[PDB]
Structures are given as C-alpha cells and as structure tokens.
C-alpha cells in the first residue's frame, strides 16, 4: 500500500533473460538443413553449417519467469499504465 | 464478409536470432490450420513536414 514507483519498460533486464532463452529455444527445436551464417574478420566470407533436420511439432506454451533466492519481482498493477514513469499501484510477486 | 490475406510459405528465411539465412525442409502434406488472437500492433511513424 501507498508505494509509488518509477517503473521502466525500455531498460528492463528480464527482457535480455528472455531473448537469450528463446534464442536458446529455437536452436534445439528448429534446426535448419543449411544455415548460411556469416563469419568474417570489406571482403568477407559466409559459412554454411548443416545438421540433421527433421520436422517436429511446434506449439508455444506459457513460460513463467520466477525470481531466484534473495530477490523479488514487483508488479505494476495500475490498469492505465503508460509503460514508463511512476506507477502508483505496485505489488510484489 | 471476412477479409482474406494472400499468404505464402517460405523455406529460405532470414532468421531473427542472428544475421544469416536458414534453409528448411519441404512443408508437411495435409491441412495445417492455426487459430490465434491478434492482441497487439507494432506501428511506426513517418514524420514529414
């Protein structure tokens, strides 16, 4: 109760712990047959990797991002949130 | 009544993880539908004068 808090949306660091756990999700699930990633150090070279590529089902399930030991996650419950600035309704979770 | 959308299916895609094209298998045979909810938009302005 009575906690106001300057939240932020564009400088979060749960986002980077999602973008590198979905990159790691699509590397064990969608294995392409031919993959032309560049690898160079003006003129550059492009590599080509090849893995065993079968077809598998792919339906995304909900993923909860829990907090480790020693921290807690706030929750901006203001139902008209601008995304940034102060958020007057704040709960822990 | 409803609007149609002339979609496609690709096999040579630019993946979003890094830079560099992927290349995938031929598509599956039968019917593959997917019902989903468009709960969002990502627009972008164009500020002239």
């Amino acid at each position, epitope marked *: 109760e009575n906690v106001t808090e300057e939240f932020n949306m564009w400088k979060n660091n749960m986002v980077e712990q999602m973008h590198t756990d979905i990159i790691s999700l699509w590397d064990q699930s969608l294995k392409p*047959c*031919v993959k*032309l990633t560049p690898l160079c150090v003006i003129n550059c070279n492009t590599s*080509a990797i*090849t*893995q065993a*590529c079968p077809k598998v089902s792919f339906e995304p399930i909900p993923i909860h991002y829990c907090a480790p030991a020693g921290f807690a996650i706030l929750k901006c419950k203001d139902k008209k949130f601008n995304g940034t600035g102060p958020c007057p309704s704040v709960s822990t979770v | 009544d409803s609007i149609t959308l002339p979609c496609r299916i690709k*096999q*040579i895609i630019n993946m979003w993880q890094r830079i560099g094209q992927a290349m995938y298998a*031929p598509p599956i045979q039968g019917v593959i539908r997917c019902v989903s909810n468009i709960t969002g938009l990502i627009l972008t302005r164009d500020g002239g004068s």
Partner: antibody
Amino acid sequence: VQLVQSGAEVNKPGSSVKVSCQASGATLNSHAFSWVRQAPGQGLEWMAGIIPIFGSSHYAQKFRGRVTISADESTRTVYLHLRGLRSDDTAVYYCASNSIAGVAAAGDYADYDGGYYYDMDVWGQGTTVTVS
Amino acid sequence: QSILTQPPSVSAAPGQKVTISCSGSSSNIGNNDVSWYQQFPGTVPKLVIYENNERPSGIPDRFSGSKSGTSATLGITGLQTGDEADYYCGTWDSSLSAVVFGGGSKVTVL
C-alpha cells in the same frame, strides 16, 4: 566429404537394377545428387537427378519413364532404378552431388520446380553395369 | 550426343597453350553456368574449373577459361604428361530441361 556407392552388377533384358549412392554428411538435404553414366569410348550423359530440399526430381529427354529415382531419408542414400535394360546401357554409373547452399543467396522466392545442378564435386567411385 | 559442339580431340606440345572452344546455344551458355570435368581413362572424373572462372582446392592456377556469349573456352596453360585426360563441357539447359554434357575433348602431349 565422401560419397560411396554399391558394387558392380550384371543384368538381363527385362529385369531391373538397384544401385545405391550413400552420403557421408548428416543428411541428404544439403546436397543435390545426380546420376550420370559413361558409355565406353564416348563421353558422359546426364540421366537423372534429385534435389531433396525442394522435393523435386529431374530427368533427361530419353530416360523418362524407364528411370525412377528415390532418395532414402534415413541412411543418407539415393537409389537409381531402371527398366528396359538394352545392350546400349552397358556402361559405368556415376553419382555426383554439389552444394545446394547457393540457392539461398538468390533474391526472395526462387524456382522450386526448377533445377540448380551445377559444379558437381563429390563424384562417387562408379558402378559398372552390364546386361546379358 | 554433343548438343554443345565440343571438339573431339586436340593436341599440342607439353607446356604450351591450348584452348578447348566448347560452344552451344543461347539456352545453355548465355543464361546458364558452365563447368568442366577432367577424367583420365579408368579414373573417377573430377572438375577443374567451375563458375566459368574458379579453381577448387587441389587444382593449379594454370587452368582457366571464359564464358563468351554462346561459347565457353578453357585457358589451359602448362601442359604435362599428367593431364592425359578427356575434358568435358557440362551445363544445365532449361530448353531440354536437363543437364547436358559436351562431346568431350581429349588433349594429348608429346
């Protein structure tokens, strides 16, 4: 990269042939196999050929109908079957693939019924066939 | 049969310059990539020049060529005994809807 075949075989007019060409990589989909012959005394002739990444298959003008060609997905091999074995077919059979990775650098959508057989590199050891 | 009109056999002195002039139509040279293959009689054939000017690993730079309109040439410098092989002219032709090889050109040295 290795590309091995089966051994030499003898045939009879009216029978068929089951010659294989088994790969060395992880799968077949990164390579575009072909099937060329070499009649003795003359050059070579492109008989058939398969591209598994698009599911297509291509043939010459003459060898349509007599030749069916199937690439087995599991053990990384491609077969070559032929019926109507006449005495002109007494030759050595060669399987040769190349890299399919150049089709991706084409702009947007490509020809998926078309053919990209060029610059074969991994020519197999050659299976000599004869009919009697 | 040679849809690409390749010469049957050429001959020159060892170390000199000889050019195989494989010509074709406008449906296999001007709008298709050509390639060449080298096979000693009794050996497995192998390419020597691809993409009209390129040499793979294991191929000397003495082999070259061109793709001029409806014709495709070979710049073959430095002839020795160990190039006693038949050279072919293979490319895709969409009009026949198949790959077509040339007539084969056998070089020989003294």
